[PDB]
From a paper:
Ssd1, a conserved fungal RNA-binding protein, is important in stress responses, cell division and virulence. Ssd1 is closely related to Dis3L2 of the RNase II family of nucleases, but lacks catalytic activity and likely suppresses translation of bound mRNAs. Saccharomyces cerevisiae Ssd1 binds RNA, but does not have detectable exonuclease activity. Transcripts associated with Ssd1 were enriched for mRNAs encoding cell wall biogenesis proteins and Ssd1 was shown to repress their translation.
To better understand the molecular basis for the function of Ssd1 as an RBP, we solved the crystal structure of the core folded domains of Ssd1. This truncated protein lacks the first 338 residues that are predicted to be natively unstructured but is sufficient to bind Ssd1-specific RNA motifs in vitro. Despite the low sequence identity between Ssd1 and yeast Rrp44 or mouse Dis3L2 (22% and 27%, respectively), the structure was solved to 1.9 Å by molecular replacement using fragments of both Rrp44 and Dis3L2. The overall structure of Ssd1 retains the RNB family domain organization: two N-terminal β-barrel cold shock domains (CSD1 and CSD2) sit at the mouth of a funnel-shaped RNB fold. Opposing CSD1 and CSD2 is a C-terminal β-barrel S1 domain. First, active RNase II nucleases have a cluster of four acidic residues that coordinate a divalent cation required for catalysis. These are absent in Ssd1 (5), with the structurally equivalent residues being Ser704, Val709, Glu711 and Phe712; this configuration is unable to coordinate a divalent cation. A similar configuration is observed in Ssd1, representing a second structural change that contributes to loss of activity. This segment blocks the lower tract of the residual active site. We conclude that the S1 insertion locks the autoinhibitory segment in place, ensuring a fixed, inactive conformation. The CSD1 insertion in Ssd1, which is only partially assigned in this structure, folds into an α-helix that blocks the mouth of the funnel, excluding RNA binding at this surface. We conclude that the RNA binding site of Ssd1 is located on the highly conserved outer surface of the cold shock domains and is required for Ssd1 function in vivo.
Residue numbers in the entry: 336 to 414, 485 to 491, 498 to 529, 536 to 561, 579 to 1189, 1194 to 1248
The structure:
């Protein structure tokens, strides 16, 4: 409690007992991307909150994602530059220091939404690292003489000291020549005697803004080398020896047969750019009951457990889906040969529900090995077409009503309709296969199939836990920590919504009740920020009272429906077959624990890769749409107001960003913390679109490294956009429009004022007043505001930035 020197770690042997006595508690370390000097350790229900870790010393060289042992401290013993900290109305304009402004543009701008942050109840320091996924990789840049400094693009990773004996030979002399090159590094050691970790160079990726390098860098930074199947002789191809194993007649005879096309009309579901791994049938049984059959490719029946393919697929762990590219879980030969197709007989694992034909209540459930021969194959796009423009009593209409009844029971709302849906909560559990430029996009067809798969996964989880108990591989998702729920509740209450938030049940119903699409999306964004992603886990390692999946309002869950892209499903499939055949399941609980946590690591990496690649292409699209103006102008909704800044979200783009007062031509600002109202005092006649803050002409400012420096006046942007609106003409260039079309992506739509010159149409949406020489604009939560939108180009990742239009411009 005096100096700032790292303490050596406690020996591993002591921790197990010390945890049992309550002297230490274990948890996962997460660094605050905004304020990197601090970190939190989340407990798996071992305490009422997260443990605050203040400063570098108390973090004791732990890294993001580490499992750490922490010793608690008196919060008082443990116990500024932010313009978003928020008696009555008072002057609050805050100029962030150059370094803080620079860091904010990256942290806020390099993700689609804004990360959340916020004397704590608990505080501690790290006394040991209990576990770390080994061999983690980091993309970044290298600069300068015995040490070269590697700067990770991941801002939760500290600078890494690279002994210059590992950097390229001619780097010490011309380090500036490599400033625009991307490297991959790893952390090798971090002793108490060094303020920084030491690491090694793994690869040189290439030019920082080369499109292929950009994607390769995203993959490597998220630990996807994607080399498990390549042939040494020829690297362009995969090793032909990797092939699915065919089934013997002994198995095929024993499977429940669904191949008679006179009795079952099975349609395989395909996803754009991906295989078909899920198929369905609906059948009238004739005795007042219906049947919904749910069929999943029986991947593991083609893979010998422990074989080379299994190990290499376990290493990959998750497929990766990006708008620009996809990376398989399995060898290409498996995708091609195992993808469900009409007329092709395929081994499957099926969950078949018998339903009351009038209420659709589930009368019974069958789970077992099967064989199908699809009669049809539909894409989700084709499913959508048929569900909107088709007979309201058709085959597919019945599937929708079944999905709706599953959904209504899941969220405990009998009258529930499948839309509106919660796209962000879905992403807490899984990633998109067909990726959209807007993370908010979900179609009815996807939701129908998704709610059926959620029921199937629920059924399989219940079955394997009942029979295998402590060895079951399950998936849970923890409710928001009390403090974050209390913050979320305060926000929606300020909005005027006072619905119950004590259970996922009532909270989700309150959100879904909101008629205003913008508000409903905004509140979902706020809710999404309070929760970490779901986690695979082994049942015996967790209290059975904490198996719940909060976001899905399910008491138990696992992953069974996507074995072609998730390795966890392979484990679940092998567990289900043991239960089916009542054979002894003899896997070590500790081995399964290591398997589940690795699956968590690679799956969260696949999620990060997907959103990073979306963000990259979206920034390119935003800049192409404003190719002549250097920026876009669109209506946005205010989500949160602070003393010197405010957050806006743009549902048409699926982004949430922060307007900073110190980047606007202001005289002052006043903040009313009781009413959540920020009053901007504008400089009359100064266009925000072209304003350069005085402090950003410093060569230390991020602005100096901006490559796309040109900004047109606001009037020019308004004119071009509104003229094109009436005309139904595109802002996007023809080359990029072709690119997005090939990728089956949709150009974002602007939100324009539906009202006079073009600029005046935007300005008339603002709430303004002139008090003598004060030119005041009021910023209210959930108000619409015109926002200038740009992607700053220059860093490894572009930075989205937003500015309020000056309503007192000429």
């Amino acid at each position: 409690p005096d100096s700032s020197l790292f303490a050596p770690y406690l020996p591993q042997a002591n921790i197990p007992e010390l945890i049992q006595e309550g002297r230490l508690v274990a948890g996962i370390l997460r660094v605050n991307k905004k304020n990197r000097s601090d970190a939190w350790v989340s407990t798996d229900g071992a305490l009422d909150a997260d443990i605050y870790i203040c400063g570098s010393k108390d973090r004791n060289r732990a890294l993001e994602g580490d499992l750490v042992a922490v010793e608690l401290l008196v919060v008082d013993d443990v116990w500024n530059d932010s313009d978003s900290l928020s008696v009555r109305r008072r002057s609050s304009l805050k100029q962030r220091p150059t370094q803080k402004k620079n860091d904010d543009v990256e942290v806020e701008g390099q993700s689609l939404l804004l990360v959340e942050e916020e004397k704590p109840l608990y505080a501690g320091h790290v006394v040991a690292v209990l576990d770390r996924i080994p061999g983690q990789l980091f993309s970044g840049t290298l600069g300068l003489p015995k040490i070269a400094w590697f700067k990770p693009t991941d801002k939760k990773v500290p600078l890494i000291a690279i002994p210059t004996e590992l950097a390229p030979k001619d780097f010490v002399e011309n380090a500036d020549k490599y400033s625009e090159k991307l490297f991959v590094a790893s952390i090798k050691r971090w002793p108490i005697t060094s303020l920084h970790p030491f690491g090694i160079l793994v690869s040189e990726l290439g030019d920082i803004h080369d499109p292929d390098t950009e994607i390769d860098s995203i993959l490597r930074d998220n630990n996807f080398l994607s080399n498990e199947y390549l042939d040494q002789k020829n690297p362009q191809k995969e090793k032909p020896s990797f092939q699915p194993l065919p089934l013997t007649a002994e198995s095929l005879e024993y499977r429940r047969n669904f191949t008679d096309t006179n009795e079952y009309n099975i349609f395989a579901i395909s996803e754009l750019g991906w295989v078909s791994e899920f198929a369905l049938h609906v059948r009238n049984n004739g005795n007042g009951t219906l049947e919904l059959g749910c069929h999943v490719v029986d991947v593991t029946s083609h893979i010998e457990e422990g074989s080379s393919v299994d190990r290499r697929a376990r290493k990959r762990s998750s497929a990766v889906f990006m708008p620009q590219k996809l990376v398989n879980l399995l060898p290409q030969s498996f995708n091609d040969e195992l993808s469900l197709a009409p007329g092709k007989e395929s081994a499957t694992l099926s969950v078949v529900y018998t339903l009351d034909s009038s209420t659709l209540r589930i009368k019974s459930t069958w789970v077992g090995e099967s064989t199908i021969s699809p009669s049809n194959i539909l894409s989700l796009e084709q499913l959508d077409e048929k569900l909107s423009t088709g007979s309201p009593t058709s085959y597919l209409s019945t599937v929708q009503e079944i999905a709706r009844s599953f959904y209504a029971r899941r969220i405990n709302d009998p009258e529930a309709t499948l839309l509106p849906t919660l796209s962000l909560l879905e992403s807490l559990d899984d990633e998109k296969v067909k990726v959209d430029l807007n993370i908010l996009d979900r179609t009815l067809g996807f939701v129908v199939i998704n709610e059926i798969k959620r029921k199937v996964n629920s059924t399989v989880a219940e079955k394997i836990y009942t029979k295998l108990g402590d060895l079951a591989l399950l998936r849970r998702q923890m409710q928001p920590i009390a403090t974050k729920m209390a913050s979320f509740r305060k926000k929606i209450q300020n909005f005027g919504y006072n619905f119950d938030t004590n259970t996922a049940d009532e909270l989700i119903k309150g959100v879904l009740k909101i008629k205003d699409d913008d508000v409903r999306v905004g509140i979902e964004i706020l809710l999404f920020k309070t929760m970490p992603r779901a986690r695979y886990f082994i049942a015996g390692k967790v209290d059975p009272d904490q198996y719940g999946h909060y976001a899905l309002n399910l008491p138990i869950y696992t992953h069974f429906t996507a074995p072609m892209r998730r390795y966890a499903d392979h484990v679940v499939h092998r567990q289900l077959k043991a239960v089916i055949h009542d054979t002894p399941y003899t896997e070590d609980m500790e081995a399964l624990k290591i398997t589940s946590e690795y699956c968590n690591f690679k799956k969260d990496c696949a999620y990060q890769a997907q959103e990073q690649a979306i963000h990259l292409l979206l920034c390119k699209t935003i800049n192409d749409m404003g190719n002549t103006t250097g920026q876009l102008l669109t209506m946005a909704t205010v989500l949160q107001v602070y003393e010197s800044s405010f957050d806006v979200f743009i549902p048409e783009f699926g982004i949430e960003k922060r307007v900073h007062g110190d980047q606007l031509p202001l005289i002052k600002a006043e903040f009313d913390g009781t009413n959540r109202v920020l009053e901007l005092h504008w400089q009359p006649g100064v266009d925000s679109a072209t304003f350069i803050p005085a402090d950003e002409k410093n060569p230390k400012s991020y602005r100096n490294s901006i490559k796309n420096k040109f900004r047109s006046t606001a009037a020019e942007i308004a004119n071009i956009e509104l003229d094109k609106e009436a005309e139904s003409e595109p802002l996007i260039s023809d080359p990029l429009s072709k690119e997005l079309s090939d990728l089956h992506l949709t150009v974002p739509n602007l939100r324009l004022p539906s009202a006079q010159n073009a600029l005046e149409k935007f300005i008339s949406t603002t709430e303004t007043r002139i008090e003598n020489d004060n030119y005041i604009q009021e910023i209210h939560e959930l108000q619409k505001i015109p926002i200038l939108l740009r992607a700053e180009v220059g860093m490894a990742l572009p930075c989205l930035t937003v500015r309020a239009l000056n309503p007192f411009m000429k």
